Amino acid sequence: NITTENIPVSEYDCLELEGGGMVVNYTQSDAPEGLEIKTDRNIFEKYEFNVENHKLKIRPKKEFRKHTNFRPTEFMVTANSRNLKKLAAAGSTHVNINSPLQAEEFEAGLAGSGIIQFHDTASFTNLKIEIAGSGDFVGHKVYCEELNGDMAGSNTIVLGGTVGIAEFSIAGSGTVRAFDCTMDELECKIAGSGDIEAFVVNKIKAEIAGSGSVKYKGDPQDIQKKVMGSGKIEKVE
Amino acid sequence: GGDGNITTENIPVSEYDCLELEGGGMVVNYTQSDAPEGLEIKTDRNIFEKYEFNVENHKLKIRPKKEFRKHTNFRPTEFMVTANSRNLKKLAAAGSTHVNINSPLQAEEFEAGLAGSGIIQFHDTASFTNLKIEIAGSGDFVGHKVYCEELNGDMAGSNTIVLGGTVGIAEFSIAGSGTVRAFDCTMDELECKIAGSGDIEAFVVNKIKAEIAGSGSVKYKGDPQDIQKKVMGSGKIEKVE
Incomplete structure (x- = not known):
């Protein structure tokens, strides 16, 4: 079941992505930080989207790394922040800086x-x-x-x-x-x-x-x- | 860099079980056999005179002489190395090389x-x-x-x-x-x-x-x-x- 969800986030300047077919559409703007995800229920359950040390980490939860093997119908990520100094991506990921x-x-x-x-x-x-x-x-x-x-x-x-x-x-x-x-x-x-x-x-x-x-x-x-x-x-x- | 003056040189070599080559456009043909070690170089004369082929502690080292290390500046028209030994435990090649083990x-x-x-x-x-x-x-x-x-x-x-x-x-x-x-x-x-x-x-x-x-x-x-x-x-x- 595909669904869109808005995830709360504090200010971040780093972006770490470890996904499976993840499509990231990021933009730099003056507005308050935003994060929206469109994917299956399986991914929302097994993935985490936490910001720590000003780094928005999108990766599988530690208790679902042994299994993995996701292959979702859709995994689109819409994010925005005032600043961005580091971008780390690992695996099947597509990162678009649209601004x-x-x-x-x-x-x-x-x-x-x-x-x-x-x-x-x-x-x-x-x-x-x-x-x-x-x-x-x-x-x-x-x-x-x-x-x-x-x-x-x-x-x-x-x-x-x-x-x-x-x-x-x-x-x-x-x-x-x-x-x-x-x-x-x-x-x-x-x-x-x-x-x-x-x-x-x-x-x-x-x-x-x-x-x-x-x-x-x-x-x-x-x-x-x-x-x-x-x-x-x-x-x- | 090669002058096109291709020469075929048979290089006296003593026992070796390690072959280390350095250069560009190199074709290496090696065989293991129950016969005395042998080495044959076929390349441009001017390049040949800039290379050494010494056996040190059973290590046959094919490379440019120390005084010509300012760069593999030379570009050979051909550079084939034909070699044989009773034993071989190591073969290292640096640069651009095609190494054939034919036995x-x-x-x-x-x-x-x-x-x-x-x-x-x-x-x-x-x-x-x-x-x-x-x-x-x-x-x-x-x-x-x-x-x-x-x-x-x-x-x-x-x-x-x-x-x-x-x-x-x-x-x-x-x-x-x-x-x-x-x-x-x-x-x-x-x-x-x-x-x-x-x-x-x-x-x-x-x-x-x-x-x-x-x-x-x-x-x-x-x-x-x-x-x-x-x-x-x-x-x-x-x-x-």
């Missing part, structure tokens, strides 16, 4: 094959992205002073916008699509057959151990390459 | 290591007491005929391990993305620890144990009478017809 996003420091974390996407402008001073698994991150309108990407596995990071200093660490066949992202400086390490595409204005430092590749647009004045293997670091137009 | 392989304990990109395949029977496989980066392991008591597969990055044969206890650790195709490998016990994304297929006779932090799928055939799991995220163990 403009702003924070001094932000950490996006994905473990598994989920998806995190900033549909609108995302503005920060420091943005950290960590992906472990075959998941995806998409942000066509990201603007930050520093961006650190830590990737392990066959995942993708699609970026667009502008970034001052961008560091990427790729372990495996992860892919970074960022030709539409103007980076002042790029520094990266690829261990494997991973692939990076970027627009670099001033400086690029790239290192590849394996057959991966780094392709950069723009005209950096300082270029440092290091390749052990068949990989390549090239300028494209 | 039956036998050892009490064996370690197959792959860093960077490439593939390691045991084309014929491979028998051990304990087999260890370590893949870091984007590497694959293929061995349709592996027979051992204990197998340990440790994967970091984006990796695949194809297995066939018979194993007593199989242990796999995946960090990042990991895939195991082992329906043709009859395992008494399956143990896996996944951190990221993992997809495991195997024939299990007695037991399955799986810990999943992220996303994971464990598909099995057979009728194991002991199945347990811990999951943080999404994980599922299921039998397939």
Whole structure:
């Protein structure tokens, strides 16, 4: 039996999601924090939605972790808060940031094959992205002073916008699509057959151990390459 | 970087049971046989002169000389390594490599290591007491005929391990993305620890144990009478017809 419920929540700036087919529609607004859930009775019974230490944790109750095996008809989450500095998602999850996003420091974390996407402008001073698994991150309108990407596995990071200093660490066949992202400086390490595409204005430092590749647009004045293997670091137009 | 001037060099080598290679575009053809150790390099001359092939404490190390470590700057037109020895307990490759074991392989304990990109395949029977496989980066392991008591597969990055044969206890650790195709490998016990994304297929006779932090799928055939799991995220163990 599918039903919609409004869950009371105190102010939170972190969001931890461990779901099964969970679809999260989050927005940042000036209004009071809100949380609405649409799912089966089984999920309401076995899942918890508690806020502690200013972190809204949506995960199965501890006494229903041994069993699991949910597979619900629907699991849509509508949430909103004044601020958001950390986003952690694990398992089958889809996180949609449907509004403009702003924070001094932000950490996006994905473990598994989920998806995190900033549909609108995302503005920060420091943005950290960590992906472990075959998941995806998409942000066509990201603007930050520093961006650190830590990737392990066959995942993708699609970026667009502008970034001052961008560091990427790729372990495996992860892919970074960022030709539409103007980076002042790029520094990266690829261990494997991973692939990076970027627009670099001033400086690029790239290192590849394996057959991966780094392709950069723009005209950096300082270029440092290091390749052990068949990989390549090239300028494209 | 290779000048296209391909040369074929037979390198004198003493007894060795460990083979460690470093480079790019390398094709390694190894065989185990009851004959004197041998080594043959076929590659561009200019690259050849930048490489060393020394045996140190039964470790045959194929890599660039110290004074040329400023980068695998060179890019070979070809680089094939043909080698043979009476025994082999370890084979490690770093960079971009294709390692072919072209004969039956036998050892009490064996370690197959792959860093960077490439593939390691045991084309014929491979028998051990304990087999260890370590893949870091984007590497694959293929061995349709592996027979051992204990197998340990440790994967970091984006990796695949194809297995066939018979194993007593199989242990796999995946960090990042990991895939195991082992329906043709009859395992008494399956143990896996996944951190990221993992997809495991195997024939299990007695037991399955799986810990999943992220996303994971464990598909099995057979009728194991002991199945347990811990999951943080999404994980599922299921039998397939």
